[PDB]
Amino acid sequence: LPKAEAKELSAFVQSCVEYKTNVCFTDVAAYESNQKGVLSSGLAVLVGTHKQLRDPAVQRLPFYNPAVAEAIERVKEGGTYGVLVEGLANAAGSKFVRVVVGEVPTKASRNNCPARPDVVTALVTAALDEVKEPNTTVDVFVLSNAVLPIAAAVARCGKHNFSAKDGAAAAAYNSGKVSRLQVVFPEPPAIPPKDLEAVATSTQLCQRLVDAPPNLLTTATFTEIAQGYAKALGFDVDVICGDDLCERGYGGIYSVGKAAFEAPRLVTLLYTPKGTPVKKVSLVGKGIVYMKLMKHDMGGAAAVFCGFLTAVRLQQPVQLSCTLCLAENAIGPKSYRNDDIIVMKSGKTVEVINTDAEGRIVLGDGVFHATNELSFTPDVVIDMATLTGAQGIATGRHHAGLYVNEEGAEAAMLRAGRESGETCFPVLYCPEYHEPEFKSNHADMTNLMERRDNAGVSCAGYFITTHLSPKFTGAHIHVDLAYPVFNSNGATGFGPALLTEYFRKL
Amino acid sequence: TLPKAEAKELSAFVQSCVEYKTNVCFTDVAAYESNQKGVLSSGLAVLVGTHKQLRDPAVQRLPFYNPAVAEAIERVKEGGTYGVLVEGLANAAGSKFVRVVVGEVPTKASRNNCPARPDVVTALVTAALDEVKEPNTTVDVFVLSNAVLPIAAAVARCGKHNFSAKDGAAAAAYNSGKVSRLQVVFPEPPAIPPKDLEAVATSTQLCQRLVDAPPNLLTTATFTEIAQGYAKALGFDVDVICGDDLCERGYGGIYSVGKAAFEAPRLVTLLYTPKGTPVKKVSLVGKGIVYMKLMKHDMGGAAAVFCGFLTAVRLQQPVQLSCTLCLAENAIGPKSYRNDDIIVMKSGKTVEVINTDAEGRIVLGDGVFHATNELSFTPDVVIDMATLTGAQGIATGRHHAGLYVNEEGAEAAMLRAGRESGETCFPVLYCPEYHEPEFKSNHADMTNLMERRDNAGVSCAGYFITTHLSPKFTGAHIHVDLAYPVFNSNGATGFGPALLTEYFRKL
Amino acid sequence: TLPKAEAKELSAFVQSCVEYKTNVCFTDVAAYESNQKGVLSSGLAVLVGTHKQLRDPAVQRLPFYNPAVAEAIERVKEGGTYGVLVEGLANAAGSKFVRVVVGEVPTKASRNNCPARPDVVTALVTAALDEVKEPNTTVDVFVLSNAVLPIAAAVARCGKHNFSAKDGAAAAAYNSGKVSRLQVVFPEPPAIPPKDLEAVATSTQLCQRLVDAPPNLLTTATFTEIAQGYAKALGFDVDVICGDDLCERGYGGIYSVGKAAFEAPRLVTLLYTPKGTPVKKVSLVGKGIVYDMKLMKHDMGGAAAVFCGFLTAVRLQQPVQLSCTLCLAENAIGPKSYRNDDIIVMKSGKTVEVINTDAEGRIVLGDGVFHATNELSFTPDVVIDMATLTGAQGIATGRHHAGLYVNEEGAEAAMLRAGRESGETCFPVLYCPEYHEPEFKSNHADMTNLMERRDNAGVSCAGYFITTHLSPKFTGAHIHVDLAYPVFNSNGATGFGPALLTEYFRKL
Amino acid sequence: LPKAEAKELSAFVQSCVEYKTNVCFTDVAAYESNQKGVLSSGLAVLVGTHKQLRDPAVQRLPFYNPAVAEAIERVKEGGTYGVLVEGLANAAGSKFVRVVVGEVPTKASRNNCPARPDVVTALVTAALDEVKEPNTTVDVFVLSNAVLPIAAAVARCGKHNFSAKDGAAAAAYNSGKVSRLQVVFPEPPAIPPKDLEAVATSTQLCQRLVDAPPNLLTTATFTEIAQGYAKALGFDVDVICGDDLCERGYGGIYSVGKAAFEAPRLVTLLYTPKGTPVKKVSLVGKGIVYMKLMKHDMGGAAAVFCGFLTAVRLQQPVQLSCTLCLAENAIGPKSYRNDDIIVMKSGKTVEVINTDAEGRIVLGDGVFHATNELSFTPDVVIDMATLTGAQGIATGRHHAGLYVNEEGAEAAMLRAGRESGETCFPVLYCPEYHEPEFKSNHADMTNLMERRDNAGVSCAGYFITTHLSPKFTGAHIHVDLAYPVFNSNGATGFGPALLTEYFRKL
């Protein structure tokens, strides 16, 4: 409401709408041709496996010398090792060039991405810590040709584009500490550079949205951001807002977000490709403003949003909806209480046993909307949410939990996680055992399982499935990504690339 | 050591376990018409099947059928029971009336469940038996499913338990006098012979008995004596590494955990070699600790492997087997293992004891090293079973044991066995590269407890155990966390043995 | 629009505070013999001193002395009281008996304590006053110590509190009718004049009133009105930055904390410039939060302390140039409220990641100290911030000693000296910024508002947080006073703080 | 009791009794003279302040070259920066020498050591993480002349001498991962090298004792260790053991340790210097075997023990006793309970309100013993213990809390902390306010304060003072070092060097 808050929020919106990646992509031969051996700056990174680093091709790289060779002997698996090279030609004027070597492990379980982009990210992040002038371009030579996972890994790495440090609040929270990164693959990448940029951009935008505090990213600013992208890329945007949610029967999302300063919203984005589509897919994302899980609770909405943008920018031949379930879970006079009975959009009634379990209610309305109210009926519904603490206990910090009603779709999403690096793992799909945990005396169901130690991740997924439209007969993929959205440095931008890869193999 | 009255009681308990015979027998409709000539075994009869099965024309031809039973079939609810009286129906007891209880089994079954839904079968029969006046009757249980293994275990599990301390049963070696003899009547002669199904049911019930038993009756000593009793009776080998020998021979894990207790810790290994050439060499390792209300059923894993072993011997399955019971009493005392102890495990690796609550995995570490390094053979497959983590319930729930497995193939096979047997399982994340860092220790090779509890808890405990496998072992390792599936609100379920029996069948 | 009845009540409460006059006066034995000619003020008299002081020949010469009083002196316990009746002793109330209560003060006093032990003095007089008959009486309190400032504050603190809502006092603007007038009688004419000691005692008791008062009476609005009332009455300046102006003018800390409340947050700055050339330029900053374990009851302690210390300075015309900035905000649960994970742009320009909304006090103070050190007509030589800030304070320095986090040995020593002299004792906590700073690492903001590890000098770290928001224009001594526990005891507020400041100002 | 446990314990005892430091000390000129410019190995460390690193003297060091200069520019404050130097002469046969530069801050509060040995330790630790082979000697060039604090700082740093990793349990838990470190000061050190070695040795032994788990360091093995040092250095040792404690009236330590497998012990060591002593000092140390504080609970006993050893080895002119209060706090049939009333050795009775507060009881007997039962009466009593969680809340992780009955002794111990780097800070000394917290209905006192938020560190100190002998009229210094004894790598060996420096300035 105050003039100063509004100026700040508009500026934040614009920063998101206009966000451009700091990463570019090329290959060794094209690099020799365009830069003619002259390093982009006083810092260069070389990243690969023990074996890859020893390949004869490496000796032919423009920064190679006997010190770099020694760096390769001395570096530890999963570690870095830096050397100075005197009088190596570079576009900055630097008497020395720093070359940081990083060794990626080859060890990778059957549930992991063989290229180990998790370590790639860590290695580059460590290398960039030795940067003191930030307005430079750092050449990152990677010896893997797994272009999609490497792109997302590098996009994720280092200092984040969202920052409030050292006066950055006056610059719309755009960090001035980020380095431009030029990724140099060995071979011309199987996915074109402009496309990889789009992927990286989405990873970073997703990261931005999740890193952003709730006083900047609100249900209102998120909506404005979506609208900005809709006008810029020419897709459709529908907004069902505040008291319209109540009037139109969306009792779940309405009751959850009803007491807040900013009104709850169901924001649906529509993309129809030029051709005949390979699949019709609906994305549903949870975005709550309220355990330091709460910091990253936009993860799901941000993920589906950014996955959607990538699909539009790459013109993927998938017909897509993206429904953002946006609500501010506020303590107030008009707020939903324990013991409220809600009439969901699906027509089913929900006894609110516990107000802490709001996410699934909001998602219930979301998935019903996606499966019942759009101009098409999807073949696949993917819901993504930072939903349960149980997720971490079950599948851990690197693997999102999958609750899926069909072996085939589950396998495909697992495959995509392994290819993209945004790994997943299944949780028990057994509705006959989940259902009884929601018995209610007076409503069709409760919102919270009676016993917390009876497949917690699965049960939350089950709840959501009860609100799918009868008109939907396809594959439903529930993605609990409570933990994979973040690490000790903040948001990871997990989700979008998983989706992009999933879409590619339809 | 012990008072004369305690020792008499413990011997009698040992004998009750060693001599335990199942209350269940198995036949089929045609054999039943032949042997009983339409006369019911008693004043109660149970009919159990799916909505469709119950409506099959064969059902009308059953000896207890009448228009009231037909009405029962119309009125019964899915997953429920409905009982009717039939006047003057011939029966070997009594009995002016016969009670016929109809139970409807659902057909709904997810891809991770057993299609026959033996979970409901158990519940239905349990409910029906609640209307029994007199015990020491035989109740005919007519089942319409031909899934004989899962039904056998399901009926074995059901109803009143053979272990009891109620109404003076303590003076009868804790053998319940409230159990009914049950005669299961399949539609067709069973694909697995009756004597074999009895063996399976017996193991389910013995396992149940061992887990139901309180820790003042089932001790590291009485469990060992029970194993020895079975060894003498069925002719298999038994090795016992006991107390201070554990320390001298380098088993620092199990030694330090159980060292302060009244009864000494023990590593009890059983050996079975079949007559022929074996299809596989398998080693079973089971955790058996005496210490929220998970602790009541903390013998679940040791009991499971023990009873699975017994079934293999009784059925003469063509598998070469070891069964190592890791038995220790986790006691508070003067000589006890503390927080911050560093233990030298049998594997040679050192373990920093961050938390004494996480003892189960240490004990198992010694167990799996023993099995993979110290026996007359090297196993192709190691299966460890334990009631290990609360996380298991959160992850896979109350009906599915969590599987941490190092090989897709073995995992798929054990899942298949769970689905066939009814003792269902589900996988947890196998990703050692991410589990390992959770056990970083300043001074030892590893800690015994993960730094962060919310990073795949079931998996990490499994990982810990794998670090103690012998380098000689290059096969499939299956870790089974069955903390919750071993029990329900009625006590022990006897989960585990039948899973193993079915897994062994399809090797 | 509050209801008509609430507004009447609140105006009356404001007036009670603005017009508050102490119940204590001060004289000496010789001036007493001269004015009262041996006639006791009333049917109760108190005699308070050390084991040795009580036995001094001067004592026998006091007008209430008799052999029963002597026997009281023998029988009384250290730290205890012992009362005797004296029949027919002359007194102005026309009472058949006079009650004489003797109290023995210990001489034991550690190097970190006030040697006069005013803590016990307070307790002794409190006990004595429990035997009071009539409520309109003056009770002569004969003290055998000449430590006038600490004794003045000790007596001001003692007994029944001027704030009361018992027995219909709500209809009398919460002015207790159970308080006795107290006449303190020193052995020698006091080194500080009586009219000055009255001003001290008044500030102690006003501070006590402000802290005792519940949050439905003392609000950000009524506290501001009270300050304004004192400004019109004593002729000092008052600046008020209020509500949405706080946001517009960049005070993001105090604005975000108090933003969802019924009553708007306020930064209230008072200005006093003495007639002469000042010995020091000092800025006081005080935290005053209303929440919307039982530390919360007394959470105005810091704002009240600095406010009352300021008033004493104006009334005594101390030669110090003073600002007093009250950081007033209601921490309310609501639709428009600041959340966990918010990033705030402080007035200092530094950004703060709100890890925990419970740690609001330091944020509000951050804006306060920046305002004081950057936005005023002068730049202070010394900044003193006072707050009921951490539970850690009690664990570290205890119930009687406020924790000092100070950037300069000299200023610390002086404030300690003032505590020991005034009786409002302090003790230092670790000053080590190089070790405090890493506890506030934030991924996205300049700092968090809460230390990563609670067991790494908790009182110090909160102090450190506050220092990060000092203006670069400031190069002087900063004294952070964590008084979470010394502001109260089992009877309510203690009025701790003002007298400490007054004594600190005296020795500049 | 088993043969294998006893073999292991004897070997552990021996490892402690015979422990020799891995650190040696010299200076630049003596180094040029002995090594003639040839580095000790393939790794060299240079550590100093921003200003010190830029001094002209630095360019004259044998490893200097333009890459090292560039390292000096690029390094961050509190950080390290490593470069390879090709073909620099070194005694190992190494084609390259790694030179790691570390920048020490000059920022230091009035309560800190100006040389910032805390950062020195961290810098050297980081540098040694790049060591290829162990059993090399690493030259550590320091630009500070604060020899005592640098000595302890380097002693503390890197991989610890106690280890159970990778088969070290079969080598009496002597790590094989440690490097020999040669510290090279600019000027010949004001304290001789052999003396600095004794200091470093004590720091590391103390570290060893505290790192050691309770199944290795027991009341019995610690006693055997003390006895081993007594035979070797020729000082006296008195042991009051088990049921003798009860018979001789030590009811505190007896009742605490009475139920354990190993008997409680009061172990007193006696050292009398050749001359007339400058002071008579009694050390008392708490050593309990029993939430992540419990790991390092020998800290106090280990500290006084090792401080004592340094005094004997340096022949400091101080008459010393060192009383180790050793007890195993066990759950058992014969154990001390809540609500027990104990008759302390001092004659005062203690109501055991809470068994968790055992440390102070044990110390009460210790200080009475020291002040009443020895051949001399001390002028100063110093008790050291890992006593309260409150300590961390009050004075933090780097500063031990001092509860002292005399301004002069307090100031001197603070001065020693600042000089030695083993920093301290005072807690409130106010007995008139501590005493009432211990009111007991039936005993002279309770063992635990009624209110936990009334100067917790101070109150525990007060309790201990009540058991001082009336014969004693000197300075009492209580040192609560619950937190400074450890960091994320284990024990710090905090305490001994503080004492040594304190003794130097008497």
Numbering used by the authors:
A (entry chain E), D (entry chain D): 5 to 294, 306 to 521
B (entry chain A): 4 to 294, 306 to 521
C (entry chain F): 4 to 295, 306 to 521
Sentences reproduced from the published study:
TbLAP-A crystals in space group P212121 with six chains in the asymmetric unit grew under citrate-containing conditions and comprise apo TbLAP-A with no metal ions in the active site. All attempts to cryoprotect the crystals prior to vitrification resulted in substantial loss of diffraction quality, and only the apo TbLAP-A crystals were successfully cryoprotected. The structures of LAP-As in their apo and holo forms and in complex with inhibitors are practically identical. The exception is the metal-free apo TbLAP-A form, whose active-site loop (aa 293 to 305) is disordered and in which no electron density for bound metal ions could be detected, most likely because of the high concentration of citrate in the crystallization buffer.
